[PDB]
């Protein structure tokens, strides 16, 4: 009975591997071996944003490309203007152990969470001129590790109990639960059209999830350690992953394979975050040795470096116009490069 | 610069004033991480000193202290739950009178102190219920569980030295910070002082290296 099921699983794995072998007629390097490079890329620090009291753990951009929210471990969220370096809002949290933050695509709400296993949602536009807790969402049994908005009253979260969940804010009850991972889930990424998302967990594995159904579409493997970051290509047909084995990788959905690996023989530190550019030609990554690297995404060549931080680069972000990049690190400063 | 921009700048300066008000207290606090077992006198230890992830803020002569109790949540192996690398000391509770679980307590001790995140953090070790240890050693010899005991199984000094030396061998070769240990009853009065002196010595030890004197 059980042995027959295990034999069937082995046969299915063999069939999947053979099918993935039969579709690789040529590699990506050969196709893109007759085009110009991007040359050398140089960036300068336009602004520096000061005022957090401790390490910085996350940040997120607004959809107007001017406003920012950042979270620190002193128990504060701050909303900044970036053209003038003015502080628009400051928010104190009830729980000082915070791990992530998000900014709604309309500008009305913010969300956060951490080691308290709860997701908190704050309202920014009231009639009494102050910010107050709109809602608290509970039901996870592990620390919250990511959250992303879909609408004003639909959110998605991932937790360290090996589960993801889609919630309806107006009612306060879970709508969908996504299960199947073996280890803690570390990151999420929403598709441009908001009908799929991807997750990466501490089993050296990534999964593609449908939203309206609740089932797993595809599973991607090939890394050899934990996965800390993930993001989509601009057109929503490929994604990139970053591990603590000091490599990044590019995966494709339709081809269902792995295309290119970004690694250098002089890097022995893990990766904390990744991101793309507006055209998808440059890939940016942040490392544990307080540096950032800009790679040519079609050739796997180092095309630039960003240096100027002091302790460790923990988070990155690119605006919806491709006009600035923001980095945040463990020395409590945020920097804007252009 | 127009008028509304000036008003916004003034608002930003007020927010800055509040943050600089809080910075002074933030930069003066001492954090201590509490760890113990299920049956150790943890609750009585907290209660008789008039003091999820629980917290306890209090004060000695002039210093503000904060004790962080994880409450048995340390089942997270290594991923990125080790975000307590800004503490000054780890304070362990052990039940000496219950010989049958000493091996488990030792394993839990060896699983924590040998982690690279806690490289520059000192360890304080409280051994609790010593009177019950005196009552138990007379009847049940400690030699029936460990074969390395050497001396009279009825003498407190030999067994206490055995326990201390058995806890010390598990540490790493690197010696940057010491290991303090106390034989205190369930509820004593010098516990606050005992922690105070052991933290003062650690801070002085680190200052002696910050001044290039060593």
């Amino acid at each position: 009975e059980l042995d027959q099921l295990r034999q069937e699983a082995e046969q299915l794995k063999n069939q999947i591997r053979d099918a993935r072998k039969a579709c690789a007629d040529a590699t990506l390097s050969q196709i893109t071996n007759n085009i110009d490079p991007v040359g050398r890329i140089q960036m300068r620090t336009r602004r520096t944003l000061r005022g957090h009291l401790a390490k910085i753990y996350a940040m997120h951009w607004g959809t107007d490309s001017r406003l920012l929210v950042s979270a620190s471990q002193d128990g504060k969220l701050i909303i900044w203007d970036s053209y003038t370096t003015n502080k628009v809002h400051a928010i104190p949290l009830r729980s000082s152990w915070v791990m992530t933050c998000a900014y709604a695509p309309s500008g009305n709400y913010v969300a956060c969470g951490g080691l308290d296993n709860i997701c908190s949602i704050y309202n920014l536009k009231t009639r009494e001129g102050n910010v107050r807790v709109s809602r608290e969402l509970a039901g996870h049994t592990g620390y919250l590790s990511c959250c992303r908005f879909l609408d004003d009253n639909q959110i998605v979260t991932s937790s360290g109990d090996t589960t993801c969940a889609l919630w309806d804010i107006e009612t306060g009850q879970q709508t969908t639960t996504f299960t199947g991972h073996t280890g803690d889930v570390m990151s999420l990424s929403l598709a441009p059209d908001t009908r799929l998302f991807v997750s990466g967990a501490c089993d050296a594995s990534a999964k593609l999830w449908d939203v309206r159904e609740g089932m797993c579409r595809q599973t991607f493997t090939g890394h050899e350690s934990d996965i800390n970051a993930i993001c989509f290509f601009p057109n929503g047909n490929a994604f990139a992953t970053g591990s603590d084995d000091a490599t990044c990788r590019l995966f494709d959905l339709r081809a269902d394979q792995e295309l290119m690996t970004y690694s250098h023989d002089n890097i022995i530190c893990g990766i904390t975050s990744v991101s793309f550019s507006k055209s998808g030609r440059l890939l940016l990554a942040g490392y544990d040795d307080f540096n950032c690297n800009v790679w040519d995404a079609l050739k796997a060549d180092r095309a630039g470096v960003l240096a100027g931080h002091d302790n460790r680069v923990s988070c990155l972000g690119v605006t919806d116009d491709g006009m600035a990049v923001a980095t945040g690190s463990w020395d409590s400063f945020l920097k804007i490069w252009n | 610069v127009s008028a509304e921009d000036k008003a916004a700048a003034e608002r930003s300066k007020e927010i800055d004033k509040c943050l600089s008000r809080e910075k002074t207290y933030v930069k003066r606090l001492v954090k201590i991480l509490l760890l113990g077992a299920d049956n150790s006198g943890k609750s009585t230890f907290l209660k008789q000193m008039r003091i999820g992830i629980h917290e306890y803020d209090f004060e000695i002569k002039n210093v503000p202290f904060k004790m962080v109790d994880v409450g048995g949540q340390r089942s997270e192996r290594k991923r990125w739950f080790e975000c307590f690398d800004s503490v000054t000391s780890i304070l362990f509770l052990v039940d000496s009178s219950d010989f049958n679980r000493l091996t488990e307590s030792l394993n839990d001790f060896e699983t924590i102190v040998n982690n690279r995140v806690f490289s520059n953090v000192s360890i304080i070790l409280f051994l609790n219920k010593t009177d019950l240890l005196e009552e138990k050693v007379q009847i049940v010899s400690i030699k029936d569980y460990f074969l390395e005991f050497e001396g009279d199984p009825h003498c407190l000094r030999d067994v206490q030295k055995f326990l201390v030396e058995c806890f010390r061998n598990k540490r790493r070769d690197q010696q940057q910070k010491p290991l303090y240990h106390h034989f205190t009853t369930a509820i004593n009065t010098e516990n606050a002082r005992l922690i105070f002196r052991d933290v003062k010595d650690t801070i002085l030890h680190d200052n002696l290296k910050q001044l290039m004197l060593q």
Partner: single-chain antibody, 232 residues
Framework: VQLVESGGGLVQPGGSRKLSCSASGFAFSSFGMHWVRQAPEKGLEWVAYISSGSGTIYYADTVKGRFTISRDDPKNTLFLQMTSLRSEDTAMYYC??????????????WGQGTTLTVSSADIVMTQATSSVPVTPGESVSISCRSSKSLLHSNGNTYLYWFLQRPGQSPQLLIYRMSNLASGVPDRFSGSGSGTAFTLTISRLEAEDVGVYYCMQHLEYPLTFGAGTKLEL
């Protein structure tokens, strides 16, 4: 949200008086406050400004040296002290709340006013008309002109449109020349250029007869228009 004023009455020339205002329902210590004035059978005009934290204080040229403004934040109260009164100070007085940051709406709530009876580089806003009859079901247009460009180098135009119904305090219709306020039906619209502006109303109905005012906010002092009357 509520602002209640007191301290009105009848005085003699050369006297002194103190007006008080009590606030209830919002964070009084995060807003700055304005004192605004209306003469009998005339238009509005601005009197004084005090900011959040008492950092900055502004007066008008006809009240400098005689009037004084203050706030008490624990008690949630605003005070105006007035001395050396004249026959030109007989009027109704309003208290207004204002908050400034990137994207706000600074003149959204007005008080109810008190009555007092006693025994240049400024920008001029014209509003050359005074009245126009109308009938429900059609559309209406109103236009104003200024003596200086209201457009800045940061891409913003500072123009505000207010409405006042018979027997009631004013309210905000439009801020910064194109933004519709909260709770206002979207029949109203605003547009214009650097020195000529228009407000348009589609499908004119009841509860829209009264006086329409326009105001600038480039630089102190703040100056009002003359106001256009709309009757059915």
């Amino acid at each position: 949200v509520q602002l209640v004023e007191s301290g009105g009455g009848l005085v003699q020339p050369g006297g002194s008086r103190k007006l008080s205002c009590s606030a209830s329902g919002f964070a009084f210590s995060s807003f700055g406050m304005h004192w605004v004035r209306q003469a009998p059978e005339k238009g509005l005009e601005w009197v004084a400004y005090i900011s959040s934290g008492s950092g900055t204080i502004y007066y008008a040229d006809t009240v400098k040296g005689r009037f004084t403004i203050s706030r008490d934040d624990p008690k949630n109260t605003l005070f105006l002290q007035m001395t050396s009164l004249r026959s030109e100070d007989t009027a109704m007085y309003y208290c207004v709340r204002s908050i400034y940051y990137y994207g706000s709406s600074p003149f959204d709530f007005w008080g109810q006013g008190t009555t007092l009876t006693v025994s240049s580089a400024d920008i001029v806003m014209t509003q050359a008309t005074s009245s126009v009859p109308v009938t429900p079901g059609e559309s209406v247009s109103i236009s104003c002109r200024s003596s200086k460009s209201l457009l800045h180098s940061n891409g913003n135009t500072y123009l505000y449109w207010f409405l006042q119904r018979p027997g009631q305090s004013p309210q905000l219709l439009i801020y910064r020349m194109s933004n519709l306020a909260s709770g206002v039906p979207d029949r109203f619209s605003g547009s214009g250029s650097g020195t000529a502006f228009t407000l348009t109303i589609s499908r004119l109905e009841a509860e829209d007869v009264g006086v329409y005012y326009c105001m600038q906010h480039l630089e102190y002092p703040l100056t009002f228009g003359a106001g256009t009357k709309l009757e059915l």
